[PDB]
């Protein structure tokens, strides 16, 4: 039934992949309220659609800044992928468009904040709390990978908490549809698999390593490999000696040692049994995968909701103007956007 879900899901994805939605709104349809996020390229603002009174989150990219950062192809990936996908724990793209200066992706507004902010504040999550979120990521990766998509930037910063306490994965700036291997050095230092650091040519397994990093960080309050400067972090990763907090259950550790596995023939998610190596782990024995999918499990944490359009679950950011030049920038580079 998982096989059957995913085959129908692939058919859905393919139609949208081969014929992307394009130019489905305009900047002037929106009232910009507040900047709720930055990076890894551009910024994301709470906006309000006049015609429905709905709130959305609008990502804006400056086309010239994208060109300078050699993110053209990645930005086209991001929008082409995001418009095509559909899964409960993936943030939804409602509209995309562009003007002379910028690209815009209007997503659904997820008011609950980034997981990062709650994780840092509270300190760490209990194993049950972390498992609840981890299960969501497992199913989301099961879904993306079945589509040949690699996500390539899992971290708490990219995981939004909705009004029901479930996750939306946001920021597809490095997501790529690739069947074999790929080589681009991208991701976030703490979450890179050794094979990326070592410039080897890698695949969807980097995402399962990054899951290992996440689970550990959710449970411990800090990541498995940290230092003040990325090079020091890479050194720790390629040694691969990870220390677990004494509070980690023996199941948690054993999950993590199979996810934070330098050896691709042994790293879970990669093997002949695929994602079932994760799903049937003992750390996950209490997990009801169908109930997680259907959003029937009771969330361990439900964010405060002060109203529609409330942004108090996000940090405050410097506000930048949206400049729209009279001359078209980078027309040809972004023609399919």
């Amino acid at each position: 039934s998982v096989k059957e879900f995913l085959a129908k899901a692939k058919e859905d994805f393919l139609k949208k992949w081969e014929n992307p939605a394009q130019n489905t709104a305009h900047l002037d349809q929106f009232e910009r309220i507040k900047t709720i996020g930055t990076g890894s390229f551009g910024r994301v603002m709470l906006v309000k659609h006049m015609e429905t009174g709905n709130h959305y989150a609008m990502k804006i990219l400056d086309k010239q800044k994208v060109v300078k950062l050699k993110q053209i192809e990645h930005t086209l990936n991001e929008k082409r992928i995001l418009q095509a996908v559909n899964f409960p724990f993936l943030v939804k793209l409602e509209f995309s468009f562009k003007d002379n200066s910028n690209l815009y992706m209007v997503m659904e507004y997820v008011p609950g904040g980034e997981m990062f902010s709650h994780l840092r504040r509270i300190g760490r999550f209990s194993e049950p709390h972390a498992r609840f979120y981890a299960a969501q990521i497992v199913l989301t990766f099961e879904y993306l990978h079945s589509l040949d998509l690699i996500y390539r930037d899992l971290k708490p910063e990219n995981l939004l908490i909705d009004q029901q306490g479930y996750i939306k994965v946001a920021d597809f700036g490095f997501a790529k549809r690739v069947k074999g291997r790929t080589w681009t050095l991208c991701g976030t230092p703490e979450y890179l698999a050794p094979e990326i650091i070592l410039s080897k040519g890698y695949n969807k397994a980097v995402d399962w390593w990054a899951l290992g990093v996440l689970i550990y960080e959710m449970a411990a309050g800090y990541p498995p490999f940290f230092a003040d400067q990325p090079i020091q972090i890479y050194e720790k990763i390629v040694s691969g000696k990870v220390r677990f907090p004494s509070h980690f259950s023996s199941d948690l550790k054993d999950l993590l040692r199979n996810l934070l596995q330098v050896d691709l023939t042994k790293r879970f998610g990669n093997l002949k049994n695929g994602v079932n190596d994760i799903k049937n782990h003992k750390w996950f024995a209490t997990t009801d995968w169908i109930a997680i999918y259907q959003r029937k499990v009771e969330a361990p944490f439900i964010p405060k909701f002060k109203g529609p359009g409330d942004t108090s679950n996000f940090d405050d950011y410097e506000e930048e103007e949206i400049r729209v030049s009279i001359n078209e920038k980078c027309g040809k580079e972004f023609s399919e956007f």
Binding site: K155, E157, C186, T188, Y222
Partner: peptide, 20 residues
């Protein structure tokens, strides 16, 4: 403790992606 080492570090804020 490891917690204290982390909290005193420069990377407890939002971490940017890298690229070459």
């Amino acid at each position: 403790t490891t917690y204290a080492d982390f909290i005193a570090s420069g990377r407890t804020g939002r971490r940017n992606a890298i690229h070459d």
